[PDB]
Design a protein around this ligand. Sequence first.
Ligand SMILES: C[C@]12CC[C@@H]3c4ccc(O)cc4CC[C@H]3[C@@H]1C[C@@H](O)[C@H]2O
Lengths: 9, 226
Amino acid sequence: QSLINLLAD
Amino acid sequence: TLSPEQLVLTLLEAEPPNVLVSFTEASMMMSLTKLADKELVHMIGWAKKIPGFVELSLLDQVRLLESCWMEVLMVGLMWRSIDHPGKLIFAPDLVLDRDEGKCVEGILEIFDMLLATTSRFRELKLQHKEYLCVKAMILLNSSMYPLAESSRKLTHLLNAVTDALVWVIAKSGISSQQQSVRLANLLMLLSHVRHISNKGMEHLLSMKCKNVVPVYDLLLEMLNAH
Ligand SMILES: C[C@]12CC[C@@H]3c4ccc(O)cc4CC[C@H]3[C@@H]1C[C@@H](O)[C@H]2O
């Protein structure tokens, strides 16, 4: 998972 | 707003899980980069538990983490290492003596800087509650790196953690003069950690560019932002 996906997860 | 005791307890519970890694120049850098990538995943989870962070704009959340990630890794390393002179406790089963920095070109200077800063925190007898505060202050851009509702919110969040740090220091019962000096010394150490971080990222990028170590996934993404 990318930074954005991790933040949005 | 939360009370300072409430805020500090929130920071405690946000603490990330610990990670385990698993020398040549290649194998030390492989271990260290694998470690960083694992910690970075948990760092994002940690940031999301800091009061107010997820209320910031997505762009601010991204830019804050892009700016501070290596500093946050480094202050954690310093805390893990604080009571072990001459050793860097990167992880359980990755405890490095200062002299093992001779394995990697350019890394010894960085180890010495990390050890010296750790020694200053030791001399200050950095408290658990202070550590929690200063790590959150790093994330919330106490450095004031240039990144309106979100900016106003961020200022509020940073002020809250600073207030909590002041409160923690005030509990020590030392003179107001000494409380002010301690705060100054802590803030100046954070500025120094920023400088070591800049050096560390330059070194990582060099090791990548020279094909000494591959860099993948989240670490790649954060490195590419520098
Ligand atoms: C040693 C170094 C700085 C500390 C990093 C570091 C600091 C704190 C941690 O918890 C993990 C790490 C892993 C990567 C480490 C970096 C590799 C080198 O390129 C150099 O910049």
